[PDB]
Amino acid sequence: GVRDVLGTLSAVWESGGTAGVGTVVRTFRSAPRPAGASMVVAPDGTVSGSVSGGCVEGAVYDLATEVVATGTPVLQRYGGGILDVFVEPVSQKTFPQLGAIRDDIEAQRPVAVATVITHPDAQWIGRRLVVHTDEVAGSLGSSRADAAVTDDARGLLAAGRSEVLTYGPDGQRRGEGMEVFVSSYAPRPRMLVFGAIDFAAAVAQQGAFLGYRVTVCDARPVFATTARFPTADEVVVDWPHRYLAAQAEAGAIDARTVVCVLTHDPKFDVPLLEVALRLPDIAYIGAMGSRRTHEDRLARLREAGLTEEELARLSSPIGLDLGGRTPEETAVSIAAEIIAKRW
């Protein structure tokens, strides 16, 4: 979200200065910039970031300037496409937690910021909560408000999603009049590819293209090699099931994590799938195979003790069934399946 311009925003913050920050909070009609996109105006008048495809930057720039002066935050609607921009003043006084959020982001700790952008009681506006998996700071001004937003915020966060939530003026689910924006900062989600066959390269590009960090992993050191996968974030040599087990235990995999089994060697894929099919959920567990391979794996897996409920979590054969033949088409059919299964 503010990731692009955060360095600039921090420098203002640390230096005791006050920045005008505008955040796209809602988009309609395919407005150029997604929800969360930011624009920051430094004390000296410099602006980094973008909120629109230039279409309303001038307006927002002025709005940000005025906001710093009055110190009153403002939700503004512009309207190709309709944009909702929240403009707020940001400084050590107005936002004490910003330094720590900056550190969370660097340290890869998920964190979310929930800001009231609409409320019948003008004083509520601009109040915010900083949410972690395990803790929460600040107050909206009501336990019931704080309680609901915290829960919803953690959910979005776990999913890495940014969104506007609506409530009654005191936090009632389903009522109306209070809206809050939740801006989630989760680290890049990861894709784990087990089996360093040539085809992994193709899988890894689709992963990169979708914004996953791809780890490629294989027990055979000839296969699992930086040289053969120069674009993968990381190449590892291990027993796939030992690697996966360890990431689980270290909390290095979360619910957006995606796993591809590109091996049908019984020495590997069965221990692997025993670990993977039993993990409190993660987004996707796919296994590459023709229809023959897929039926023989399922058999082996049943014989290994997997239950139908566990087996259900498995996407096999891998990919949507688009009819593709070349490996590139299989790779796209996989990417398509990943997207589909999360929406």
By CB under 8 A, name the binding residues for a copy of itself.
Answer: 29-30, 32, 34, 53, 198, 205-206, 209-211, 290, 292, 320, 322-326, 328-329, 331-333, 335-336, 339-340, 342-343
Residue with Cβ nearer a copy of itself (174 or 325): 325
Residue with Cβ nearer a copy of itself (304 or 322): 322
Four-point Cα dihedral 133, 137, 142, 145, nearest 10: -30
Residue 308: exposed, middle, or buried by beta-carbon count in 10 A (0-12, 13-18, 19+)? exposed
Regarding beta strands 284-287 and 314-315, do their DSSP bridges make them parallel or antiparallel, or are they unpaired? parallel
Strand residues in 146-189 grouped as ranges (E): 163-167, 178-185
DSSP lists the bridge partners of residue 135 as: none
Q: Which helix (H) or strand (E) holds 339?
A: helix 327-342
Report, in Å, the least distance between residue 96 CB and a copy of itself.
Answer: 32
Residue with Cβ nearer a copy of itself (120 or 211): 211
Residue with Cβ nearer a copy of itself (176 or 198): 198
Report, in Å, the least distance between residue 316 CB and a copy of itself.
Answer: 15
Residue with Cβ nearer a copy of itself (199 or 279): 199
Place of tokens 């408000």: 145
CB 77 within 8 A of CB 28: no
Report, in Å, the least distance between residue 16 CB and a copy of itself.
Answer: 37
Report, in Å, the least distance between residue 169 CB and a copy of itself.
Answer: 30
Report, in Å, the least distance between residue 259 CB and a copy of itself.
Answer: 18
